[PDB]
mmCIF file of all heavy atoms in Angstrom:
data_model
loop_
_atom_site.group_PDB
_atom_site.id
_atom_site.type_symbol
_atom_site.label_atom_id
_atom_site.label_comp_id
_atom_site.label_asym_id
_atom_site.label_seq_id
_atom_site.Cartn_x
_atom_site.Cartn_y
_atom_site.Cartn_z
ATOM 1 N N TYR A 1 -5.330 9.680 -8.376
ATOM 2 C CA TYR A 1 -3.961 9.422 -7.934
ATOM 3 C C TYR A 1 -3.935 8.930 -6.503
ATOM 4 O O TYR A 1 -3.106 8.064 -6.160
ATOM 5 C CB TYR A 1 -3.150 10.696 -8.077
ATOM 6 C CG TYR A 1 -1.709 10.633 -7.675
ATOM 7 C CD1 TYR A 1 -0.734 10.288 -8.601
ATOM 8 C CD2 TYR A 1 -1.290 10.988 -6.401
ATOM 9 C CE1 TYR A 1 0.588 10.258 -8.257
ATOM 10 C CE2 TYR A 1 0.058 10.949 -6.045
ATOM 11 C CZ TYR A 1 0.981 10.583 -6.979
ATOM 12 O OH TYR A 1 2.326 10.546 -6.656
ATOM 13 N N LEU A 2 -4.781 9.487 -5.643
ATOM 14 C CA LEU A 2 -4.775 9.020 -4.253
ATOM 15 C C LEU A 2 -5.168 7.555 -4.155
ATOM 16 O O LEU A 2 -4.732 6.853 -3.228
ATOM 17 C CB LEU A 2 -5.702 9.897 -3.404
ATOM 18 C CG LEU A 2 -5.154 11.244 -2.934
ATOM 19 C CD1 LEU A 2 -6.263 12.124 -2.421
ATOM 20 C CD2 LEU A 2 -4.104 11.017 -1.846
ATOM 21 N N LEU A 3 -5.982 7.074 -5.092
ATOM 22 C CA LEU A 3 -6.351 5.646 -5.085
ATOM 23 C C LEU A 3 -5.289 4.818 -5.818
ATOM 24 O O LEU A 3 -4.766 3.845 -5.246
ATOM 25 C CB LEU A 3 -7.726 5.467 -5.743
ATOM 26 C CG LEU A 3 -8.143 4.004 -5.948
ATOM 27 C CD1 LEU A 3 -8.223 3.258 -4.607
ATOM 28 C CD2 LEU A 3 -9.499 3.927 -6.655
ATOM 29 N N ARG A 4 -4.922 5.224 -7.036
ATOM 30 C CA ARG A 4 -4.064 4.408 -7.876
ATOM 31 C C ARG A 4 -2.642 4.359 -7.352
ATOM 32 O O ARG A 4 -1.997 3.292 -7.363
ATOM 33 C CB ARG A 4 -4.090 4.938 -9.319
ATOM 34 C CG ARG A 4 -3.389 4.082 -10.327
ATOM 35 C CD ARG A 4 -3.363 4.785 -11.648
ATOM 36 N NE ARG A 4 -2.447 5.918 -11.614
ATOM 37 C CZ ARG A 4 -1.154 5.826 -11.906
ATOM 38 N NH1 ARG A 4 -0.647 4.648 -12.237
ATOM 39 N NH2 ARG A 4 -0.361 6.891 -11.837
ATOM 40 N N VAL A 5 -2.125 5.479 -6.860
ATOM 41 C CA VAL A 5 -0.731 5.550 -6.415
ATOM 42 C C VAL A 5 -0.595 5.541 -4.906
ATOM 43 O O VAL A 5 0.113 4.696 -4.341
ATOM 44 C CB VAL A 5 -0.021 6.789 -7.002
ATOM 45 C CG1 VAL A 5 1.389 6.907 -6.403
ATOM 46 C CG2 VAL A 5 0.037 6.710 -8.519
ATOM 47 N N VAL A 6 -1.260 6.453 -4.206
ATOM 48 C CA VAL A 6 -0.970 6.661 -2.803
ATOM 49 C C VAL A 6 -1.516 5.526 -1.961
ATOM 50 O O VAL A 6 -0.756 4.854 -1.213
ATOM 51 C CB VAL A 6 -1.515 8.018 -2.310
ATOM 52 C CG1 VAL A 6 -1.161 8.220 -0.806
ATOM 53 C CG2 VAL A 6 -0.938 9.169 -3.149
ATOM 54 N N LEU A 7 -2.805 5.247 -2.058
ATOM 55 C CA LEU A 7 -3.388 4.191 -1.224
ATOM 56 C C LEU A 7 -2.860 2.825 -1.638
ATOM 57 O O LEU A 7 -2.509 2.002 -0.764
ATOM 58 C CB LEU A 7 -4.917 4.206 -1.333
ATOM 59 C CG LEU A 7 -5.530 3.194 -0.336
ATOM 60 C CD1 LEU A 7 -6.727 3.804 0.351
ATOM 61 C CD2 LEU A 7 -5.917 1.873 -1.031
ATOM 62 N N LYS A 8 -2.816 2.540 -2.933
ATOM 63 C CA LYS A 8 -2.433 1.178 -3.327
ATOM 64 C C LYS A 8 -0.942 0.907 -3.099
ATOM 65 O O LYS A 8 -0.566 -0.257 -2.946
ATOM 66 C CB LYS A 8 -2.848 0.936 -4.774
ATOM 67 C CG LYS A 8 -4.372 0.753 -4.861
ATOM 68 C CD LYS A 8 -4.868 0.366 -6.237
ATOM 69 C CE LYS A 8 -6.385 0.159 -6.186
ATOM 70 N NZ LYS A 8 -6.982 -0.104 -7.546
ATOM 71 N N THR A 9 -0.109 1.953 -2.976
ATOM 72 C CA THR A 9 1.273 1.735 -2.583
ATOM 73 C C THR A 9 1.381 1.518 -1.070
ATOM 74 O O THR A 9 2.022 0.567 -0.626
ATOM 75 C CB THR A 9 2.140 2.922 -3.015
ATOM 76 O OG1 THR A 9 2.045 3.064 -4.431
ATOM 77 C CG2 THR A 9 3.589 2.673 -2.628
ATOM 78 N N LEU A 10 0.740 2.389 -0.266
ATOM 79 C CA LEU A 10 0.735 2.199 1.185
ATOM 80 C C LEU A 10 0.160 0.821 1.553
ATOM 81 O O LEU A 10 0.607 0.176 2.497
ATOM 82 C CB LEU A 10 -0.104 3.286 1.856
ATOM 83 C CG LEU A 10 0.533 4.658 2.091
ATOM 84 C CD1 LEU A 10 -0.513 5.629 2.600
ATOM 85 C CD2 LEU A 10 1.680 4.566 3.074
ATOM 86 N N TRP A 11 -0.847 0.370 0.797
ATOM 87 C CA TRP A 11 -1.512 -0.891 1.088
ATOM 88 C C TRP A 11 -0.515 -2.055 1.089
ATOM 89 O O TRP A 11 -0.694 -3.017 1.859
ATOM 90 C CB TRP A 11 -2.612 -1.133 0.072
ATOM 91 C CG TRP A 11 -3.559 -2.222 0.436
ATOM 92 C CD1 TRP A 11 -3.400 -3.562 0.233
ATOM 93 C CD2 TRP A 11 -4.839 -2.084 1.069
ATOM 94 N NE1 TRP A 11 -4.496 -4.249 0.694
ATOM 95 C CE2 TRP A 11 -5.401 -3.352 1.210
ATOM 96 C CE3 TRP A 11 -5.566 -0.985 1.540
ATOM 97 C CZ2 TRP A 11 -6.630 -3.581 1.777
ATOM 98 C CZ3 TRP A 11 -6.815 -1.187 2.117
ATOM 99 C CH2 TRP A 11 -7.336 -2.490 2.235
ATOM 100 N N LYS A 12 0.511 -1.983 0.276
ATOM 101 C CA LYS A 12 1.486 -3.050 0.156
ATOM 102 C C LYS A 12 2.617 -2.972 1.162
ATOM 103 O O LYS A 12 3.457 -3.883 1.220
ATOM 104 C CB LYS A 12 2.079 -3.060 -1.270
ATOM 105 C CG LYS A 12 0.998 -3.234 -2.325
ATOM 106 C CD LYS A 12 1.578 -3.167 -3.738
ATOM 107 C CE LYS A 12 0.459 -3.302 -4.777
ATOM 108 N NZ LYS A 12 -0.256 -4.609 -4.659
ATOM 109 N N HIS A 13 2.662 -1.907 1.971
ATOM 110 C CA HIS A 13 3.702 -1.775 2.978
ATOM 111 C C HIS A 13 3.589 -2.885 4.026
ATOM 112 O O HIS A 13 2.489 -3.303 4.398
ATOM 113 C CB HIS A 13 3.630 -0.418 3.656
ATOM 114 C CG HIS A 13 4.846 -0.058 4.426
ATOM 115 N ND1 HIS A 13 5.078 -0.517 5.705
ATOM 116 C CD2 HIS A 13 5.917 0.700 4.099
ATOM 117 C CE1 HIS A 13 6.246 -0.047 6.132
ATOM 118 N NE2 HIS A 13 6.761 0.703 5.198
ATOM 119 N N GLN A 14 4.753 -3.322 4.522
ATOM 120 C CA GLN A 14 4.795 -4.389 5.501
ATOM 121 C C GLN A 14 3.985 -4.049 6.762
ATOM 122 O O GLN A 14 3.544 -4.968 7.477
ATOM 123 C CB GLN A 14 6.263 -4.726 5.866
ATOM 124 C CG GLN A 14 7.224 -3.517 5.918
ATOM 125 C CD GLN A 14 7.990 -3.266 4.620
ATOM 126 O OE1 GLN A 14 7.482 -2.696 3.642
ATOM 127 N NE2 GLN A 14 9.269 -3.703 4.605
ATOM 128 N N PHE A 15 3.815 -2.770 7.073
ATOM 129 C CA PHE A 15 3.089 -2.338 8.268
ATOM 130 C C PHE A 15 1.664 -1.891 7.974
ATOM 131 O O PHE A 15 1.024 -1.272 8.820
ATOM 132 C CB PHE A 15 3.812 -1.189 8.966
ATOM 133 C CG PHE A 15 5.200 -1.537 9.496
ATOM 134 C CD1 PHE A 15 6.123 -0.540 9.654
ATOM 135 C CD2 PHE A 15 5.522 -2.836 9.841
ATOM 136 C CE1 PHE A 15 7.410 -0.838 10.161
ATOM 137 C CE2 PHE A 15 6.797 -3.125 10.333
ATOM 138 C CZ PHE A 15 7.734 -2.133 10.492
ATOM 139 N N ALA A 16 1.144 -2.206 6.760
ATOM 140 C CA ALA A 16 -0.197 -1.749 6.409
ATOM 141 C C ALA A 16 -1.290 -2.567 7.051
ATOM 142 O O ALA A 16 -2.393 -2.032 7.292
ATOM 143 C CB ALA A 16 -0.397 -1.792 4.878
ATOM 144 N N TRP A 17 -1.035 -3.828 7.369
ATOM 145 C CA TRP A 17 -2.115 -4.759 7.705
ATOM 146 C C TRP A 17 -2.994 -4.325 8.879
ATOM 147 O O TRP A 17 -4.210 -4.623 8.833
ATOM 148 C CB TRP A 17 -1.552 -6.169 7.941
ATOM 149 C CG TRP A 17 -0.575 -6.286 9.066
ATOM 150 C CD1 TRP A 17 0.790 -6.229 8.985
ATOM 151 C CD2 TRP A 17 -0.871 -6.547 10.443
ATOM 152 N NE1 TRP A 17 1.359 -6.399 10.222
ATOM 153 C CE2 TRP A 17 0.344 -6.597 11.140
ATOM 154 C CE3 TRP A 17 -2.054 -6.716 11.160
ATOM 155 C CZ2 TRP A 17 0.417 -6.804 12.516
ATOM 156 C CZ3 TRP A 17 -1.989 -6.919 12.518
ATOM 157 C CH2 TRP A 17 -0.758 -6.977 13.186
ATOM 158 N N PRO A 18 -2.516 -3.655 9.940
ATOM 159 C CA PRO A 18 -3.449 -3.244 10.996
ATOM 160 C C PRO A 18 -4.449 -2.195 10.545
ATOM 161 O O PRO A 18 -5.484 -2.013 11.179
ATOM 162 C CB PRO A 18 -2.535 -2.660 12.080
ATOM 163 C CG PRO A 18 -1.184 -3.196 11.769
ATOM 164 C CD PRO A 18 -1.135 -3.265 10.287
ATOM 165 N N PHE A 19 -4.170 -1.522 9.424
ATOM 166 C CA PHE A 19 -4.927 -0.362 9.001
ATOM 167 C C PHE A 19 -5.769 -0.658 7.767
ATOM 168 O O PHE A 19 -6.380 0.260 7.216
ATOM 169 C CB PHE A 19 -3.952 0.813 8.751
ATOM 170 C CG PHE A 19 -3.050 1.081 9.940
ATOM 171 C CD1 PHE A 19 -1.756 0.578 9.983
ATOM 172 C CD2 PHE A 19 -3.500 1.826 11.008
ATOM 173 C CE1 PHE A 19 -0.921 0.798 11.073
ATOM 174 C CE2 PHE A 19 -2.691 2.061 12.099
ATOM 175 C CZ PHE A 19 -1.398 1.550 12.146
ATOM 176 N N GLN A 20 -5.870 -1.920 7.363
ATOM 177 C CA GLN A 20 -6.582 -2.277 6.151
ATOM 178 C C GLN A 20 -8.079 -2.511 6.362
ATOM 179 O O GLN A 20 -8.800 -2.772 5.390
ATOM 180 C CB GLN A 20 -5.943 -3.531 5.523
ATOM 181 C CG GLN A 20 -4.615 -3.214 4.888
ATOM 182 C CD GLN A 20 -3.889 -4.453 4.384
ATOM 183 O OE1 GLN A 20 -4.236 -5.577 4.780
ATOM 184 N NE2 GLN A 20 -2.905 -4.258 3.525
ATOM 185 N N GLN A 21 -8.558 -2.392 7.589
ATOM 186 C CA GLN A 21 -9.983 -2.582 7.916
ATOM 187 C C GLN A 21 -10.283 -1.816 9.176
ATOM 188 O O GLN A 21 -9.368 -1.466 9.933
ATOM 189 C CB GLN A 21 -10.289 -4.089 8.101
ATOM 190 C CG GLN A 21 -9.465 -4.768 9.189
ATOM 191 C CD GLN A 21 -8.031 -5.046 8.719
ATOM 192 O OE1 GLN A 21 -7.841 -5.566 7.638
ATOM 193 N NE2 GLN A 21 -7.053 -4.666 9.544
ATOM 194 N N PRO A 22 -11.556 -1.527 9.448
ATOM 195 C CA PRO A 22 -11.920 -0.932 10.748
ATOM 196 C C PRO A 22 -11.372 -1.776 11.896
ATOM 197 O O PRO A 22 -11.273 -3.003 11.802
ATOM 198 C CB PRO A 22 -13.435 -0.951 10.739
ATOM 199 C CG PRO A 22 -13.783 -0.844 9.293
ATOM 200 C CD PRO A 22 -12.725 -1.643 8.559
ATOM 201 N N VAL A 23 -10.949 -1.109 12.973
ATOM 202 C CA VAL A 23 -10.542 -1.832 14.181
ATOM 203 C C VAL A 23 -11.707 -2.689 14.653
ATOM 204 O O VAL A 23 -12.800 -2.195 14.893
ATOM 205 C CB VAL A 23 -10.068 -0.859 15.272
ATOM 206 C CG1 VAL A 23 -10.024 -1.565 16.634
ATOM 207 C CG2 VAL A 23 -8.710 -0.268 14.936
ATOM 208 N N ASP A 24 -11.456 -3.993 14.766
ATOM 209 C CA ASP A 24 -12.453 -4.914 15.339
ATOM 210 C C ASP A 24 -12.125 -5.043 16.813
ATOM 211 O O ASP A 24 -11.212 -5.788 17.202
ATOM 212 C CB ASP A 24 -12.411 -6.264 14.596
ATOM 213 C CG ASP A 24 -13.559 -7.196 15.055
ATOM 214 O OD1 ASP A 24 -14.013 -7.070 16.215
ATOM 215 O OD2 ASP A 24 -13.962 -8.054 14.252
ATOM 216 N N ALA A 25 -12.834 -4.279 17.656
ATOM 217 C CA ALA A 25 -12.481 -4.227 19.057
ATOM 218 C C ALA A 25 -12.787 -5.542 19.780
ATOM 219 O O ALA A 25 -12.133 -5.845 20.785
ATOM 220 C CB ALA A 25 -13.188 -3.073 19.744
ATOM 221 N N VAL A 26 -13.760 -6.314 19.288
ATOM 222 C CA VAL A 26 -14.042 -7.623 19.870
ATOM 223 C C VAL A 26 -12.947 -8.620 19.526
ATOM 224 O O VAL A 26 -12.466 -9.370 20.375
ATOM 225 C CB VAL A 26 -15.420 -8.123 19.404
ATOM 226 C CG1 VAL A 26 -15.710 -9.481 20.002
ATOM 227 C CG2 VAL A 26 -16.513 -7.117 19.775
ATOM 228 N N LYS A 27 -12.565 -8.654 18.228
ATOM 229 C CA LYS A 27 -11.552 -9.613 17.780
ATOM 230 C C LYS A 27 -10.201 -9.296 18.410
ATOM 231 O O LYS A 27 -9.493 -10.218 18.850
ATOM 232 C CB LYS A 27 -11.456 -9.573 16.250
ATOM 233 C CG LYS A 27 -10.784 -10.743 15.594
ATOM 234 C CD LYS A 27 -9.297 -10.552 15.374
ATOM 235 C CE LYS A 27 -8.708 -11.642 14.481
ATOM 236 N NZ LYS A 27 -9.160 -13.016 14.919
ATOM 237 N N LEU A 28 -9.834 -8.021 18.467
ATOM 238 C CA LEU A 28 -8.500 -7.611 18.948
ATOM 239 C C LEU A 28 -8.444 -7.428 20.454
ATOM 240 O O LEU A 28 -7.392 -7.051 20.967
ATOM 241 C CB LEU A 28 -8.090 -6.308 18.253
ATOM 242 C CG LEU A 28 -8.017 -6.366 16.738
ATOM 243 C CD1 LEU A 28 -7.698 -5.003 16.145
ATOM 244 C CD2 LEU A 28 -6.976 -7.404 16.312
ATOM 245 N N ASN A 29 -9.537 -7.687 21.167
ATOM 246 C CA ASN A 29 -9.611 -7.508 22.603
ATOM 247 C C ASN A 29 -9.171 -6.112 23.016
ATOM 248 O O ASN A 29 -8.299 -5.913 23.860
ATOM 249 C CB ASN A 29 -8.789 -8.605 23.311
ATOM 250 C CG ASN A 29 -9.109 -9.991 22.784
ATOM 251 O OD1 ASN A 29 -8.196 -10.770 22.502
ATOM 252 N ND2 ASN A 29 -10.381 -10.288 22.611
ATOM 253 N N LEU A 30 -9.770 -5.118 22.380
ATOM 254 C CA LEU A 30 -9.553 -3.706 22.669
ATOM 255 C C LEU A 30 -10.881 -3.077 23.053
ATOM 256 O O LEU A 30 -11.417 -2.230 22.337
ATOM 257 C CB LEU A 30 -8.948 -2.978 21.442
ATOM 258 C CG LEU A 30 -7.644 -3.550 20.870
ATOM 259 C CD1 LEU A 30 -7.358 -2.937 19.483
ATOM 260 C CD2 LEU A 30 -6.509 -3.267 21.832
ATOM 261 N N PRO A 31 -11.448 -3.510 24.208
ATOM 262 C CA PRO A 31 -12.808 -3.088 24.538
ATOM 263 C C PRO A 31 -12.938 -1.590 24.831
ATOM 264 O O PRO A 31 -14.070 -1.081 24.855
ATOM 265 C CB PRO A 31 -13.151 -3.917 25.788
ATOM 266 C CG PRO A 31 -11.834 -4.195 26.389
ATOM 267 C CD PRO A 31 -10.834 -4.322 25.256
ATOM 268 N N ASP A 32 -11.837 -0.883 25.018
ATOM 269 C CA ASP A 32 -11.901 0.552 25.241
ATOM 270 C C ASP A 32 -11.644 1.369 23.983
ATOM 271 O O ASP A 32 -11.638 2.594 24.048
ATOM 272 C CB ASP A 32 -10.899 0.970 26.324
ATOM 273 C CG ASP A 32 -9.488 0.586 25.982
ATOM 274 O OD1 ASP A 32 -9.285 -0.260 25.092
ATOM 275 O OD2 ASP A 32 -8.561 1.129 26.617
ATOM 276 N N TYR A 33 -11.415 0.704 22.829
ATOM 277 C CA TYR A 33 -11.015 1.451 21.657
ATOM 278 C C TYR A 33 -12.041 2.492 21.278
ATOM 279 O O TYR A 33 -11.707 3.682 21.108
ATOM 280 C CB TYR A 33 -10.797 0.519 20.461
ATOM 281 C CG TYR A 33 -10.284 1.281 19.266
ATOM 282 C CD1 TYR A 33 -8.918 1.631 19.174
ATOM 283 C CD2 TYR A 33 -11.131 1.724 18.265
ATOM 284 C CE1 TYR A 33 -8.444 2.355 18.117
ATOM 285 C CE2 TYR A 33 -10.654 2.447 17.189
ATOM 286 C CZ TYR A 33 -9.317 2.770 17.109
ATOM 287 O OH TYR A 33 -8.834 3.514 16.053
ATOM 288 N N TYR A 34 -13.302 2.088 21.126
ATOM 289 C CA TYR A 34 -14.334 3.023 20.711
ATOM 290 C C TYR A 34 -14.915 3.814 21.882
ATOM 291 O O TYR A 34 -15.725 4.705 21.668
ATOM 292 C CB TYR A 34 -15.430 2.286 19.949
ATOM 293 C CG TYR A 34 -14.963 1.750 18.615
ATOM 294 C CD1 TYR A 34 -14.717 0.390 18.426
ATOM 295 C CD2 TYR A 34 -14.693 2.604 17.549
ATOM 296 C CE1 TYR A 34 -14.266 -0.101 17.212
ATOM 297 C CE2 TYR A 34 -14.244 2.131 16.332
ATOM 298 C CZ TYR A 34 -14.034 0.768 16.166
ATOM 299 O OH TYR A 34 -13.574 0.318 14.937
ATOM 300 N N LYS A 35 -14.488 3.527 23.108
ATOM 301 C CA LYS A 35 -14.722 4.453 24.178
ATOM 302 C C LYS A 35 -13.785 5.637 24.116
ATOM 303 O O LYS A 35 -14.082 6.693 24.667
ATOM 304 C CB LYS A 35 -14.565 3.739 25.531
ATOM 305 C CG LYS A 35 -15.510 2.566 25.637
ATOM 306 C CD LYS A 35 -15.345 1.882 26.981
ATOM 307 C CE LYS A 35 -16.130 0.564 27.040
ATOM 308 N NZ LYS A 35 -17.575 0.730 26.701
ATOM 309 N N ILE A 36 -12.659 5.508 23.404
ATOM 310 C CA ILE A 36 -11.698 6.581 23.261
ATOM 311 C C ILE A 36 -11.776 7.235 21.887
ATOM 312 O O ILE A 36 -11.749 8.472 21.794
ATOM 313 C CB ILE A 36 -10.272 6.060 23.543
ATOM 314 C CG1 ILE A 36 -10.172 5.607 25.011
ATOM 315 C CG2 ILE A 36 -9.233 7.129 23.226
ATOM 316 C CD1 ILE A 36 -8.924 4.794 25.325
ATOM 317 N N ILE A 37 -11.867 6.460 20.829
ATOM 318 C CA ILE A 37 -11.802 6.952 19.464
ATOM 319 C C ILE A 37 -13.224 7.159 18.974
ATOM 320 O O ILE A 37 -13.980 6.193 18.779
ATOM 321 C CB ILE A 37 -11.041 5.993 18.539
ATOM 322 C CG1 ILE A 37 -9.586 5.854 19.014
ATOM 323 C CG2 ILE A 37 -11.074 6.470 17.101
ATOM 324 C CD1 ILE A 37 -8.836 7.181 19.044
ATOM 325 N N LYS A 38 -13.597 8.424 18.757
ATOM 326 C CA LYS A 38 -14.953 8.731 18.339
ATOM 327 C C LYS A 38 -15.062 9.078 16.859
ATOM 328 O O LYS A 38 -16.166 9.279 16.357
ATOM 329 C CB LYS A 38 -15.533 9.881 19.176
ATOM 330 C CG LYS A 38 -15.502 9.648 20.687
ATOM 331 C CD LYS A 38 -16.255 8.382 21.074
ATOM 332 C CE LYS A 38 -16.239 8.218 22.579
ATOM 333 N NZ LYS A 38 -16.995 7.007 23.014
ATOM 334 N N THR A 39 -13.933 9.133 16.147
ATOM 335 C CA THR A 39 -13.941 9.347 14.704
ATOM 336 C C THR A 39 -13.094 8.269 14.045
ATOM 337 O O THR A 39 -11.958 8.540 13.577
ATOM 338 C CB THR A 39 -13.426 10.743 14.341
ATOM 339 O OG1 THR A 39 -14.182 11.722 15.067
ATOM 340 C CG2 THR A 39 -13.622 11.036 12.856
ATOM 341 N N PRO A 40 -13.579 7.034 13.983
ATOM 342 C CA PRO A 40 -12.769 5.938 13.438
ATOM 343 C C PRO A 40 -12.508 6.126 11.955
ATOM 344 O O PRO A 40 -13.328 6.673 11.217
ATOM 345 C CB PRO A 40 -13.627 4.700 13.694
ATOM 346 C CG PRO A 40 -14.739 5.142 14.591
ATOM 347 C CD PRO A 40 -14.925 6.589 14.370
ATOM 348 N N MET A 41 -11.346 5.644 11.518
ATOM 349 C CA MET A 41 -10.994 5.689 10.096
ATOM 350 C C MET A 41 -9.912 4.656 9.849
ATOM 351 O O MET A 41 -9.073 4.397 10.701
ATOM 352 C CB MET A 41 -10.539 7.062 9.656
ATOM 353 C CG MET A 41 -10.395 7.210 8.129
ATOM 354 S SD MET A 41 -11.843 6.645 7.183
ATOM 355 C CE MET A 41 -13.137 7.682 7.901
ATOM 356 N N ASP A 42 -9.955 4.056 8.642
ATOM 357 C CA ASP A 42 -9.036 3.020 8.254
ATOM 358 C C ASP A 42 -8.861 3.034 6.737
ATOM 359 O O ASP A 42 -9.667 3.657 6.020
ATOM 360 C CB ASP A 42 -9.518 1.648 8.711
ATOM 361 C CG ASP A 42 -10.792 1.258 8.003
ATOM 362 O OD1 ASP A 42 -11.890 1.692 8.422
ATOM 363 O OD2 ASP A 42 -10.695 0.526 6.975
ATOM 364 N N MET A 43 -7.841 2.338 6.235
ATOM 365 C CA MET A 43 -7.575 2.380 4.801
ATOM 366 C C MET A 43 -8.566 1.555 3.985
ATOM 367 O O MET A 43 -8.757 1.843 2.798
ATOM 368 C CB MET A 43 -6.151 1.908 4.502
ATOM 369 C CG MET A 43 -5.082 2.853 4.973
ATOM 370 S SD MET A 43 -3.534 2.673 4.082
ATOM 371 C CE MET A 43 -3.071 1.016 4.490
#
């Protein structure tokens, strides 16, 4: 259910796109991201 209903519904939300992949700190110019976040997680 967490895959079929919960994740796949959240995935379609208009605000889901930043959370659909690991933060790419080089692409997003967030060079301090992984200096701060030591337990990364994404959808």
Side-chain angles (χ1 to χ4, degrees):
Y1 180 89
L2 280 166
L3 174 59
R4 188 186 71 88
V5 174
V6 181
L7 186 137
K8 287 185 178 175
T9 302
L10 280 172
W11 193 276
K12 301 177 182 300
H13 195 279
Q14 37 265 80
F15 297 155
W17 61 266
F19 307 98
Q20 287 174 343
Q21 57 284 313
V23 164
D24 187 333
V26 179
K27 199 267 190 314
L28 301 175
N29 311 133
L30 304 166
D32 58 343
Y33 184 81
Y34 292 106
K35 303 180 188 307
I36 296 167
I37 298 301
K38 304 303 182 179
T39 307
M41 189 51 56
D42 66 278
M43 291 203 298

